[PDB]
Amino acid sequence: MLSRLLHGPGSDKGHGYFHPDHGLVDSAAQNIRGPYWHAENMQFMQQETAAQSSKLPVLSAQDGKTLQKIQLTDGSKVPKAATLVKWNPKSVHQWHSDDILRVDMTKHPEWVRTMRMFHGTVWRHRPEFRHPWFSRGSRASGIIMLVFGAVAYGEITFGKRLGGV
Amino acid sequence: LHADPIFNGSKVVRSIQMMRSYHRLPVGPEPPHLKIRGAPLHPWSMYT
Amino acid sequence: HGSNLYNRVHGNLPQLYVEQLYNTDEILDTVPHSSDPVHHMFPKCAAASPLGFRPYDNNKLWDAFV
Amino acid sequence: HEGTLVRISQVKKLSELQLHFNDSHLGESELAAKVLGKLRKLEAEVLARNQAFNEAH
Amino acid sequence: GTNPGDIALNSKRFTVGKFVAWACGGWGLKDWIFPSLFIGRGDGPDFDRIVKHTLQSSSAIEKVNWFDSPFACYTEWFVEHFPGFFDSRYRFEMSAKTILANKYPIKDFPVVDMRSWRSSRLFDLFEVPHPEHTFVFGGPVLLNTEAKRAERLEQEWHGKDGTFVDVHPLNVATESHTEVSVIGGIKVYNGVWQGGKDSWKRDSAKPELTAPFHSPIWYRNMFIVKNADQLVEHFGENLSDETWQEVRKEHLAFHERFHKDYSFA
Amino acid sequence: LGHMRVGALWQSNANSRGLPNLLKEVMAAEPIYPYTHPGLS
Amino acid sequence: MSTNKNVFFPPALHLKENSIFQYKFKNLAVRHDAARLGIILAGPTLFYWFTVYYFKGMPNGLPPVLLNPFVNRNYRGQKRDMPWGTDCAFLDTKCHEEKDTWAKRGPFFII
Amino acid sequence: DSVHVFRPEFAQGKFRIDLDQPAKQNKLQQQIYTLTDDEREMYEDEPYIGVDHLYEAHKGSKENPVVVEAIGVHGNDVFTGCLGGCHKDAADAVAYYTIVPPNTLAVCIDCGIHFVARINEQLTFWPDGTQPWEKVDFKAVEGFLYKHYKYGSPLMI
Amino acid sequence: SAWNFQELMESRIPDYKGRPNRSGAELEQVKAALPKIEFMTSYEFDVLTKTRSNLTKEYSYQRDMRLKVTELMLDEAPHELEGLAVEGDAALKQLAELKALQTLTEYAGDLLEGQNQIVQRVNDFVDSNPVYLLDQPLREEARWNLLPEMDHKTRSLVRTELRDWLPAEYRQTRAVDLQQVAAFSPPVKADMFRAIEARAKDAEAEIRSLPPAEQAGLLALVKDNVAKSKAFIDPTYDITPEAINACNDVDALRAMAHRVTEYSGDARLLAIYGKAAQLTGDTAAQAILKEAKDLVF
């Protein structure tokens, strides 16, 4: 099918676009309401809150109650005392529940790098300027290339290669 | 007595100075393009 | 066009204009502000036409040379 | 106090319905000096914030 | 037009500017030797024409508030280049005054300026020279986004039934209304607060604070937009077509003594 | 820095020219109350 | 209110498999990709070495190609100046040694 | 049995603005399509639904105008337009654009339609991860809005 | 699968289905569950919900702001009108004072417009960030759906919550229509007329405590104000049953019936139409009027 090859509906023009069976999934839905195409074979776990992180620079912007409502887990082994809650498709609210166990993904290197880009450096409108010495090297390279070009033009035209003087 | 400027204040004037649609051709009730020979040229003609 | 640094610093997220203390060009290398002045294409013509003048005067040697 | 919108139910004279810019009367040099002072205060606060974050995360 | 600037320093026979123009463009010996052919009348105000247009006017020139308006600095340009300017301006001002003296509570005034002209190409709606950054906050919004879509064709394109597109369940519930009123012991549910599109009426008019509550006066400036390539205007409820044709005939009949003595060659 | 503007109140620029007040343009230097409130001081 | 909550503390989900890996290898597309990989690993690769083992002590008796005869040793008097000065092919390392070709070194920088 | 945690999308700024309110942003960036030639033919011969159009006031009357909403800066003129042919005597070859002051009643005297182009500013919390996760009240918002009205705020560019 | 050209959210095509297919048992169950319903003509709903006094459909806080600004402007008028000097006769001085008053009012009108714009901007902010002003479960239903695309119950709940998030002086609720409430409640009209007469008498006393010429001018103004205020509250206050009984003209009775029908369509229609039927011998009309007074009124 040309339509399906070029990322279209396919044979049926009223058909959708996503085929999560072969890896064509919806990132927006996953980020907002979680991967509801894994809903049949995955279940939320229900029962260490997040209040211990209420004093950190980036999490201090939240209220105490908000962090108290969040319950954490080690994220490796199943808590044997934790019940299982069925994951209901077509329900946009279950991914945001406070009764389900969660995992503190605030020590992830990507998390730290993002928040540092926002909370750990002086804001520069130009990412190249966010690195001072590299910008220095780059402008120096530009000047070097200008000089090299001028010298090469001078040498090739006049037939003397500047090494004997 | 001067209040804070607002875009719909009482002291806003029609923008007839800065041109926007330069190549337009005005329409509406307009005179016939009469052509008398030896008469002064009309202001609204292509000739001056 | 005059700078807008007073409004920028007194505005809503002043932390974004701290770099303005460093080697920075406001027109080129700074976060635009909601109250910034409108920059035109050819400022010389943009400033001369509303006054009725053309940008360059042949009497001035600098204008003639440019 | 400069943190709130004007409530008309508490206004006593029409002059209270206009915004007041304390620095509208300063000269160019004084205004520039004031802006630079505010910029340096902001710079100090930003550096303190950056230190606090980089030490904790 | 053009602003000559300093007339004094450009009248001299020999000038740096004239020599530069000769060298690079705009001047030559043809102007020094034959000014009557290549300079001739030049470009400037025509005092004789201004006097003629002034003395052809009726007593309207006395009764017009033009000389106190912010556009009074353009009096000579419009007296010279707009024959019958004062009579037309007097009719315009009397039209505004009679709209002001109406019996309607809302006085609508038509506004036309450089923005009142539509165009099929977006670069024609900006001031020249164009701003450095344009359409920063997105492009145009089409009025057609507020019209009902072609439901039948939309269903048909998808291979859906669409049989009952015009048959909808009725809805009679208190849960569907947020605007509740009590009118003489009757609790009327009617409407939902939508937001910015429910307050278009008040945000468009400005009150006369001295007018009593039983005889309100509101001022509204109605903007007018036209294509200028259409040749036919349809004002809607503001002006009927028959009245517009009548006004066209009368305007062309009155403003004829100001136009008949000139040729367009 | 030059003449930095103070505040962010509306200014007539290229992006915005405002809504003209035709009544003030026409009734310039002439009262309106002789028409809206005839006969009253 | 913001989605950042689920970015900061994403929910933890329960599986019936010992790892996501196993659970992720019940999709038929991943199974077919693994099958293609196994096809290439099993057939061609194991066979290749097999042939290498089968003909380990036997000659490569393919006749050599004939490039340039004896009467055309001068290449019809054609110029043969390489951009690196001498008249040796780039990767003819041994031939370079008989024509130096690398004594004419330049400077590290413009001077 | 095992626990899985899907890797979240950490990007902030424009992406997090899009993912916080996907309905509004999609509305802003959702393409809609116009009718082809055969579809125009099939639409022009569809029937009216009821005799209401003979009595009611059309959409685009002096009392029932076409109100439209753009995003921008307060007081900036709004760009709006027709697709052409709202009237029999109006052109329909291509879309026709318009520049109009905000929050004012304008009349197109090509078609005869009254419209209310108006601006809503997209003031949103600084997206750096400090956005609030639970219902917020009017105090902090009051301060931010006061500062924006009095001085203005940066642009997300 | 190696590419992904998705968008933030796919467009939504409505599914129409149709009116419910309720069987006989379901039909009877529904009919037995309904209240005592009175089906109303569209004219009745129109007169109930017509725009009479609040011409511009302005909310409460806008009217309050306008009245407050008028009070503040009046408190400052004498200072602005004090000491004016101009070369001319009395008429020229009067025109100068009129121009000064106009300038004062134009100054005060701009502050009011600025404040209206500011409150409108606050409410625009409320709409622009709905998910940040809502609790669960309405938050996700505001996140995923636009106003036209919500269920009626969820739509109403979301809008009410967003309105109530604001302080009392920013909530956008329509102001009361004096003429409407007077037209649909006879006591309210009587109270309004009593208030008008009380204010007229008090103003007459205040005037009588003033020098002569001002007395005549202000008394004429008071008479005009009372007349127009009454005509504003109830234009048909002169169509009394006494007047109806005194009217023996068919055209006049028709005019009265039209004027009442425009205003409220109340039992005075029964009176007018009964007197018209008697004068013309319309037995069918009399039967219909009996039915109406039994059911309609």
Ligand SMILES: [Zn+2]
């Ligand atoms: Zn149109």
